[PDB]
């Protein structure tokens, strides 16, 4: 759900403003892939599965009995009195989805505004979804993949 | 544990008549009649015992 992803992006911005160290997001495959990319790119300190009440200390198998109570817990980073994850916005919106070929993704990473999408800025992460997998735009260009430009994180 | 006799049957029949007048559907609110109808309708359409949704 792109709506759920929009909710998460707005949630992370709200948490950054108040500087909470730990927050939770909905437990779904898309959310987990989104969070994992942020973690590997250095935007998130930690990524743990858990429940509505907090991160799990020991592994808890997820089943239909507890799926409704599952959450993903992410740790936010702050350095030099500045939040590392300041902004998080969707590019492809629920009411206007954007699919780009690899050629147009290369132009976006080269300073060209494609379909009103502002080009990639220094230190910014743009995520792309291809065949239900989320990857950095630079990785999609390396794999010659065409995909939906989901969001940009800075 | 026994060794006021028994009540006359006419008195026990009057106790039954009072209980059946107090519990008569024709003496109760219309909402009670509708509650019974909902149960009857549910059992004619249910897929299994306990199917209400």
């Amino acid at each position: 759900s792109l709506v759920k992803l929009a909710n998460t992006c707005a949630h992370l911005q709200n948490c950054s403003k108040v500087r909470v160290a730990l927050t939770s997001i909905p437990y779904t495959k898309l959310q987990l892939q989104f969070a994992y990319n942020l973690y590997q790119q250095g935007f998130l300190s930690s990524l743990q599965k858990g429940s509505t009440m907090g991160p799990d200390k020991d592994f808890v198998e997820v089943t239909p009995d507890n799926i409704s109570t599952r959450r993903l817990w992410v740790g936010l980073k702050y350095r030099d009195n500045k939040p590392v994850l300041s902004s998080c916005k969707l590019i492809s919106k629920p009411n206007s989805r954007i699919h780009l070929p690899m050629e147009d993704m290369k132009k976006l990473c080269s300073g060209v505004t494609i379909r009103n999408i502002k080009p990639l800025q220094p230190g910014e992460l743009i995520l792309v979804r291809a065949h239900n997998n989320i990857m950095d735009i630079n990785e999609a260009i390396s794999k010659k993949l065409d995909g939906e430009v989901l969001c940009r994180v800075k | 544990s026994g060794l006021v006799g028994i009540e006359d049957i006419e008195k026990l029949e009057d106790r039954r008549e009072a209980i059946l007048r107090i519990l008569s559907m024709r003496n109760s609110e219309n909402k009670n009649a509708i509650k019974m109808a909902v149960e009857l309708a549910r059992k004619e359409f249910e897929r299994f015992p306990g199917d209400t949704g």
């Binding site: - | 049957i9 026990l12 029949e13 039954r16």
Partner: protein, 117 residues
């Protein structure tokens, strides 16, 4: 039929305590089908379905409680668990996963408390 249960049950309990056998009883032996008039026949004329439900509910609760205790204990003792599986016909249960084998245990505990009963 003006005859009422209370009155009829007051004749089967007075005729059974006085010895009188008016033809009404024979009729009552047809109104209800109760050919024999004993203290254990009025108790079976006045049986309420609720009583049966109360016993079915205890059996249902027993089964659930027994299945859970059995599997709970079996899992606590890996040795008794491995034996349990072999006794029920599992081949080399030792070489199995927790989920691949707990399902077997659950399927067996529920095959030893629901099939035998």
């Amino acid at each position: 039929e003006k005859t009422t249960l209370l009155r009829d049950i007051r004749t089967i309990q007075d005729a059974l305590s006085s010895g009188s056998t008016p033809k009404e009883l024979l009729e009552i032996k047809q109104r209800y089908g109760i050919q024999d008039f004993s203290q254990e026949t009025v108790r079976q004329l006045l049986q309420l379905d609720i009583s049966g439900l109360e016993v079915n509910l205890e059996k249902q609760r027993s089964l659930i409680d027994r299945i859970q205790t059995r599997l709970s204990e079996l899992l606590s003792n890996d040795l008794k668990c491995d034996q349990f599986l072999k006794d029920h016909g599992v081949e080399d249960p030792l070489t199995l996963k927790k989920n691949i084998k707990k399902n077997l245990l659950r399927k067996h505990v529920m095959m030893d408390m629901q099939q035998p009963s």
